[PDB]
Write a protein that binds this ligand. Structure first.
Ligand SMILES: Cc1cccc(C)c1Nc1c(-c2c(F)cccc2F)nc2cccc(C)n12
Lengths: 228, 11
């Protein structure tokens, strides 16, 4: 029925940090000006990807309790959650942050950057599937924190410490569903569906990067070596 | 490792 004062505090801290994330206008304006070529389209996606990485780290550092974790575990979580958090934020940018005209041109650019349909089709399918949920800013922020604070990432030394940080967030999210959608008890279940849908991108993204060869314009060592 | 380590540890 109501969030406890402690849950309200946790939500406020997540919301404040999430609302501060921004994709700069300098990047967004390039979508309407740059040449419509595979090389220029991919350069825009490179700029977006680097902004996604910087935003992910700044959001993560501010997550309540993240600073209390073992330093190596902090890195393991960032590395492990990077793809999922990037795909989740890219869905928010595409569906909510960009005006219709910018999103139509961004899609045009994504589809003409020389990337195989094998990786482009699941991306727009995910954007549509998440778009159906009409997710609030609170749901986007909590889902992002939940993805980042996943205790089953590779090479975490103290998983129980991560579990203690992730569990209050899942509790707040389910309570928010009960408060905002009391007639729809399957709403939290629908949000969980997006978590597993996000997990499938771990392999799709890794296969995508491996499909681009060293001499190709798409090979971007700054981003690709985060996973190599 | 390099990039994620720098971004986390910087102020
Ligand atoms: C912004 C964008 C949109 C659609 C497709 C792509 C390839 C991108 N950009 C990249 C992403 C990426 C992301 F940033 C968000 C979502 C999904 C992602 F595949 N990952 C990487 C890794 C190396 C280089 C780039 C250009 N790149």
């Amino acid at each position: 029925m109501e969030l406890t004062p402690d849950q309200q505090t946790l939500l406020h801290f997540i919301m404040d940090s999430y609302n501060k994330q921004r994709m700069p206008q300098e990047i967004t304006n390039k979508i309407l000006k740059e040449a419509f070529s595979a090389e220029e389209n991919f350069l825009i996606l490179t700029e977006m990807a680097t902004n996604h990485v910087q935003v992910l780290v700044e959001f993560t550092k501010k997550l309540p309790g993240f600073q209390t974790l073992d330093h190596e575990d902090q890195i393991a979580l960032l590395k492990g959650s990077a793809v999922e958090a990037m795909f989740l934020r890219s869905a928010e940018i595409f569906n909510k942050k960009l005006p219709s005209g910018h999103s139509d041109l961004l899609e045009a650019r994504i589809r003409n950057s020389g990337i195989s349909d094998e990786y482009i089709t699941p991306m727009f399918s995910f954007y549509k599937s998440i778009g159906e949920l009409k997710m609030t800013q609170e749901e986007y922020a909590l889902l992002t924190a939940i993805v980042i604070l996943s205790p089953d990432r590779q090479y975490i030394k103290d998983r129980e410490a991560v579990e203690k940080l992730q569990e209050p967030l899942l509790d707040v999210l389910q309570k928010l569903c009960k408060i905002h959608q009391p007639e729809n008890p399957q709403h939290f279940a629908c949000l969980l569906g997006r978590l597993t849908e996000l997990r499938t991108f771990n392999h799709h993204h890794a296969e995508m990067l491996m499909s681009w060869r060293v001499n190709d314009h798409k090979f971007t060592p700054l981003l690709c070596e985060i996973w190599d | 490792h390099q990039l994620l380590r720098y971004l986390l540890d910087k102020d």
